[PDB]
Amino acid sequence: VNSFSGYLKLTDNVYIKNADIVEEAKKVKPTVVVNAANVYLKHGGGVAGALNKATNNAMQVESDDYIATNGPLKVGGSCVLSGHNLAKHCLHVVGPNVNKGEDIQLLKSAYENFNQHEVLLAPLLSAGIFGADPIHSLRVCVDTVRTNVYLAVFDKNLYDKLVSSFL
Numbered sequence: 001v002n003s004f005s006g007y008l009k010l011t012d013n014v015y016i017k018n019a020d021i022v023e024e025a026k027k028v029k030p031t032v033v034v035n036a037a038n039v040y041l042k043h044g045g046g047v048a049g050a051l052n053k054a055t056n057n058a059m060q061v062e063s064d065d066y067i068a069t070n071g072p073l074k075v076g077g078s079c080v081l082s083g084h085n086l087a088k089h090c091l092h093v094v095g096p097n098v099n100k101g102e103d104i105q106l107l108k109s110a111y112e113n114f115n116q117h118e119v120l121l122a123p124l125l126s127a128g129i130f131g132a133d134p135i136h137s138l139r140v141c142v143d144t145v146r147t148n149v150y151l152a153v154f155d156k157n158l159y160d161k162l163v164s165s166f167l
């Protein structure tokens with residue numbers, strides 16, 4: 001038993017809710033919140049900008065030190081950093097950005113990072129400003145992640161579509 005509420009169960013291990021991941025994070029304090037990161041951990045907009053703002057820019061300060069030490073992430077890769085006031089940990093995951101021409105097949109590699117964590121609160125990778133089809137992203141999530149994932153979908157219209165079209 002865990003503290004997530006109002007989720008619709010999609011599969012054995014995937015759940016989904018129309019929610020603002022920032023607000024869901026501040027209420028659940030999950031062990032892991034997933035960020036929709038870029039390779040530079042520049043949290044300017046989308047999910048990342050919103051999560052960083054909720055940390056009063058502490059996420060960005062920590063991220064800049066991470067990059068200065070380690071260099072950029074790979075597309076499809078991830079790193080674990082602090083969750084600040086939102087979660088114990090933040091898993092920063094880089095899905096391919098269609099608006100940068102990156103290969104969509106890397107979306108499966110991105111979701112594989114979730115399997116290193118038993119339970120996660122996460123957005124749909126490569127959705128939103130990353131330019132992928134969220135229905136495709138949901139399909140890859142369901143077919144790749146084996147751990148328990150609680151997906152927060154900000155847009156109510158999209159949430160309903162995702163539900164109504166789910167196979």
Ligand SMILES: Nc1ncc(S(=O)(=O)N2CC(F)(F)C[C@H]2C(=O)O)cn1
Nearest residue numbers: 046047050123127128134153154155
């Ligand atoms: N607060 C906040 N801001 C942005 C995002 S998103 O852009 O990553 N995301 C992914 C999506 F589902 F495909 C569309 C969008 C959403 O959930 O409506 C998430 N949460």
